[PDB]
Homo-oligomer: A and B are copies of this chain.
Amino acid sequence: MFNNEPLEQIDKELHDILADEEKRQRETINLIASENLTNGAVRECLGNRVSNKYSEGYPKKRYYGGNDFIDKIEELCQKRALEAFNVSDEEWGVNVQPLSGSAANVQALYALVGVKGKIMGMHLCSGGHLTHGFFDEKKKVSITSDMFESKLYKCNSQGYVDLDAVREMALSFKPKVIICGYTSYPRDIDYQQFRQICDEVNAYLFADISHISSFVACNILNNPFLHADVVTTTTHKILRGPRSALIFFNKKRNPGIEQKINSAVFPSFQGGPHNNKIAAVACQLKEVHSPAFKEYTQQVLLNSKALAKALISKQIDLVTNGTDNHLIVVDLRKFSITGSKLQETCNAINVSLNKNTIPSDVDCVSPSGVRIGTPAMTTRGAKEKDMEFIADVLARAIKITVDLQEQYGKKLVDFKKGLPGNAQLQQLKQEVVTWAGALPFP
């Protein structure tokens, strides 16, 4: 008693929008630092009937039976996850059930400190995530600032984490957890100095490595696993998995953390896991551990350095004047345009990026930069020499944005009226589409 007609027939309306979406992804220079493109195998897992199964609890200790094949999948994912990040299953544990990055972090934090517990994280405006305690005078914006007592540390006026301030804060504030690893931080993290600070005050070290997961995995950047009690990571960004998350916990530094984290995920916060996700995460974690994927990750950094260099060559300023990873933050103050305006301009030429705060921005209202990253375009096959063209297109959008602002004014709603029909944008869009539409597409 069901309709098994294909998507095209069953729902032509939805199917057109999805074919349109696919064409827009195919014809876009995607510079969203947090985005990537999943291969066919990962997407086959996500559409697999394994998502029909309710399997609350953990492998073996399920509430229901009929979960023998689901237990192998979930155990195969855990194993492949510990292998990928070069950790011993005797020393480290992993929970593979969190539905996404934000859930993973709220659950893990709750395990460690509970309700009313004290946490420290980087401010959102300085490159921290919402789930690192974000609030503002007017509201406890994140649940992590409300169900916990959070305090927030800032980067210095050059974009770097200020460890002297972290200590000043940790000593007086006395948190049970300090969060490092960030959403728009263009440099590597000194986890050892974090570990040193946490020991001093008795707090846990929480490393959220969602943006830099592949680099840690492939030993191209510092290893938080040497110093951290907990590591969380999304699986959908540079790692190139599905939309999901992983929580890692250091059993040796903290026996009985295994039970706190697993119970926090279920039954404290979640119900039934999403086994299609777990299958998909398994499939990608095998690719992660090949030598092929290390080649890819290295290309991400090569492309990002080259992109950094070419933008500097065209006199564009970058936060910290460079990058040690996949992402760059462009400081747009010298052109007197906001990041929102350039985001719209770039949207009109099929260039995907996001507006992003810089150290000088007091508020998160009207951010003065944009963030770009290379994982997506590196997946689509761009090499070092391709970065001069992206740098060229970005330079040309900044110039056009400046022209349009002069003509139409500095109000965002007035600015946008200039965008449609603009001859240079149409020319530039066309140039973007021709280069983008040609690149390999999974």
- With A352-B64, A354-B63, A354-B64 as contacts: A102 and B270 at CB distance below 8 Å: yes
- Write the chain B residue with the least CB distance to A26: B49
Q: How many copies of this chain does the complex contain?
A: 2
**Known contacts A66-B28, A99-B103, A347-B65, A50 near B34 by CB under 8 Å:** no
The answer to whether the Cβ of A291 comes within 8 Å of any Cβ in the partner chain is no
Task: Note all chain B residues with C-beta closer than 8 A to A94.
Answer: none
The smallest C-beta distance from A299 to any residue of chain B, in angstroms, reads 6
A101 to chain B, nearest CB (A): 6
Closest to A24 in B: B69
CB-based nearest B residue for A353: B64
Task: Specify which of B21, B66, B141 is in contact with A347 (CB 8 Å cutoff).
Answer: B66
CB distance from A27 to the nearest CB of B (A): 11
**Which residues of A are at the interface with B, using a C-beta cutoff of 8 A?**
1-7, 10-11, 13-14, 17-18, 20-22, 24-25, 28, 30, 32, 34-41, 43-54, 63-66, 68-70, 72-73, 76, 99-103, 106, 110, 114-115, 130-131, 134, 141-143, 146-147, 236, 240, 242-243, 267-272, 274, 276, 279, 282-283, 286-287, 292, 295-296, 299, 343-344, 346-347, 350, 352-355, 378-381, 440, 442
Known: A49-B21, A344-B65. A143 touches B269 (CB 8 A): yes
The reply to whether A51 and B46 contact each other, CB–CB distance below 8 Å, is: yes
A64 vs B34: C-alpha distance when bound (angstroms) = 12
Q: Which residue from B18, B30, B54 sits with its C-beta under 8 Å from A48?
A: B18
- Cross-chain pairs A/B with CB under 8 angstroms, 12 sampled: A3-B292, A4-B442, A11-B41, A14-B76, A25-B49, A46-B51, A64-B352, A99-B103, A101-B271, A103-B269, A106-B269, A115-B147
Neighbouring B residues of A346 by C-beta, 8 Å = 65
Known: A14-B283, A64-B343. A21 touches B141 (CB 8 A): no
Cβ–Cβ contact B141 & A268, under 8 A? yes
Decide if B130 touches A267 in the complex (CB within 8 Å).
yes
Residue contact B4 to A40, C-beta cutoff 8 Å: yes
Q: Which of A41, A43, A106, A442 has the most CB of B within 10 A?
A: A41
Nearest B-chain residue to A130, judged by Cβ: B267
In the complex, residue of chain B having the shortest beta-carbon distance to the beta carbon of A282: B14
Is B39 within 8 A of A1, CB to CB?
no
**With contacts A103-B270, A270-B100 known, is A51 near B38, CB below 8 A?**
yes
